[PDB]
């Protein structure tokens, strides 16, 4: 029984009377969850994991792609767009017959290499597929301390995934009918930046600095996300200007967006009038380091995102699939 890639199936507690599009998708693609799900510990077993070379992530990516293509599909670029209810629900990925999922329960597993307290499970934990850049919202948190993960930290081209241990509530709200904004506690964010700098400090050998994004598509320069069917784009300049030994971020709703899942563009109706508000738990970050021209005085980190595989990766890192034979 060695790691093998195969199509998993998904389970969820989606609600069939609900037209909310995650519920509609899940009703068709997923099955109800097992009432008493078993989890078995594997004594005297070491097994290797690699979140960056994990097929589970790809399958989830493909699944969420078909989810958006089925549920949302407004119009543009070659094509009706009723408004829809949008709020991710937790999805479990489950192994068919003849396969099994190994789960790493090791404390502070950095994402790659040997895991010695390995167990087997029928299904993953419930994972809500939140689409976001630079910040990870409504995700899972490491219990002991913040955990940062990378395929090779010394490769500046390679993304860094930060997992928080304390979450930071962020409230975004729309009472210019397109003007919105997000609020979070400054002191707690300063302390968050601190707990990240301490772990970055474990690697460096180097004084750390945070900068806002250098550029690129709107989706990755800002904290881009969905809320009530509307697409928010928040300036994160205020979160990421810092140098180490309340915060209102101005946001805009955009009708014309890039589709994260394929080349082209999607165009939606302007947002509905009335009340739009999202209170989300910031639970992680995706960061990128400049490199190439560092200097003994500054290491620069910037908010990242764009490849949603990393979003899934932040939840599926503890899991691997094997052909039980």
């Amino acid at each position: 029984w060695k790691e093998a890639e195969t199509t998993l199936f998904c389970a969820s507690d989606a609600k069939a009377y609900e037209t909310e599009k995650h519920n509609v998708w899940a009703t068709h693609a997923c099955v109800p969850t097992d009432p008493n799900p078993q989890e078995i510990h594997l004594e005297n077993v070491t097994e290797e994991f690699n979140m960056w070379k994990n097929n589970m992530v790809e399958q989830m990516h493909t699944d969420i792609i078909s989810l958006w293509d089925q549920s949302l599909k407004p119009c543009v670029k070659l094509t009706a767009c009723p408004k829809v209810t949008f709020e991710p629900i937790p999805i479990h990925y489950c192994a068919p017959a003849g396969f099994a999922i190994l789960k790493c329960k090791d404390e502070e597993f950095n994402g790659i290499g040997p895991c010695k307290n390995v167990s087997t499970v029928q299904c993953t934990h419930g994972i809500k597929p939140v689409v976001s850049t630079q910040l990870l919202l409504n995700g899972s948190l490491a219990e002991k301390e913040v955990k940062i993960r990378c395929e090779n930290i010394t490769n500046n081209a390679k993304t860094i995934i930060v997992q928080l241990v304390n979450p930071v509530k962020i409230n975004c709200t729309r009472p210019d009918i397109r003007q919105a904004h997000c609020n979070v506690n400054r002191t707690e964010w300063n302390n968050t930046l601190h707990q990240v700098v301490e772990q970055l400090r474990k690697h460096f050998n180097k004084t750390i600095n945070f900068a806002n994004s250098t550029g690129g598509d709107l989706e990755i320069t800002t904290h881009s996300f969905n809320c009530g069917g509307e697409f928010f784009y928040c300036n994160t300049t205020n979160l990421f200007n810092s140098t180490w030994n309340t915060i209102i971020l101005p946001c805009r709703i955009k009708q014309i967006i890039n589709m994260w899942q394929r080349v082209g563009q999607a165009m939606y109706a302007p947002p509905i009038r009335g009340v739009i508000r999202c209170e989300s738990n910031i639970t992680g970050l995706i960061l990128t380091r400049d490199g190439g021209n560092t200097n003994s005085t500054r290491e620069t980190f910037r908010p990242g995102g764009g490849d949603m595989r990393d979003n899934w990766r932040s939840e599926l890192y503890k899991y691997k699939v094997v052909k039980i034979e």
Partner: antibody, heavy 123, light 106 residues
């Protein structure tokens, strides 16, 4: 074959040149695309890349004159090189690379190249 | 990082074993290799991590670890006389080696 391009040609010194690189949907969606130039009788020089996430990265040695961008509407990537000099004269390639980021195998290696765009800076 | 290649030129007769060298300023996991003929773009020979890309014939092999890498051609064919570059991925900017020219011995 996979990556088409259409860069400029003769440029007067001081001007700027923009080179586009039309990519297949798959390459554009899944791969990194380097911008690499090669002057006559010399080896290749890495100028910058665009990751599938949209991340732009440029060579420290060109960052003041070089701007990269991608067009998610059409699946095209671009490089602009400004303040052209005679020694910027080279064949410019866009070329793709999984960079250990594609789903199967996770391989590095520049396996597909555009046809190249010759840029000759002179008056 | 920086990569240097040796020799500058390799003179060889057809049938002979070619071995090209690539040296790295710091520790690398691997390096990739390209073949280039005049007027054409580089053609990938060796993927990273090793071994060899699709379409590449069997006579091509590659090896090394850490600082030192080499590309080996077991039995040189006329088609193999060309310029070969090695290339590194440790961080941007990604450096190419200066190239080793393979010519016909005389």
């Amino acid at each position: 074959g996979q990556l088409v391009q259409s860069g400029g040609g003769v440029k007067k010194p001081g001007t700027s040149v923009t080179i586009s690189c039309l990519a297949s949907e798959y390459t554009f969606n899944e791969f990194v695309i380097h911008w690499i130039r090669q002057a006559p009788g010399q080896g290749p020089v890495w100028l910058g890349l665009i990751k599938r996430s949209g991340r732009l990265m440029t060579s420290y040695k060109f960052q003041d004159r070089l701007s990269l961008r991608r067009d998610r509407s059409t699946g095209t990537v671009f490089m602009e090189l400004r303040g052209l000099r005679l020694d910027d004269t080279a064949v410019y390639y866009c070329a793709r690379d999984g960079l250990g980021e594609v789903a199967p195998a996770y391989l590095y290696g520049i396996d597909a190249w555009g046809q190249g765009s010759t840029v000759i800076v002179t008056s | 990082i920086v990569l240097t290649q040796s020799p500058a030129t390799l003179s060889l007769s057809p049938g002979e074993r070619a071995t090209l060298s690539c040296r790295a300023s710091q520790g690398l996991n691997f390096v990739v290799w390209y073949q280039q003929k005049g007027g054409q773009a580089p053609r990938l020979l060796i993927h990273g991590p090793t071994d060899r890309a699709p379409g590449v014939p069997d006579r091509f092999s590659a090896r090394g670890s850490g600082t030192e890498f080499s590309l080996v051609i077991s039995s040189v064919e006329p088609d193999d006389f060309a310029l070969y570059y090695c290339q590194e991925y440790s961080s941007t900017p990604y450096n190419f080696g200066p190239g080793t020219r393979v010519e016909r011995k005389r």
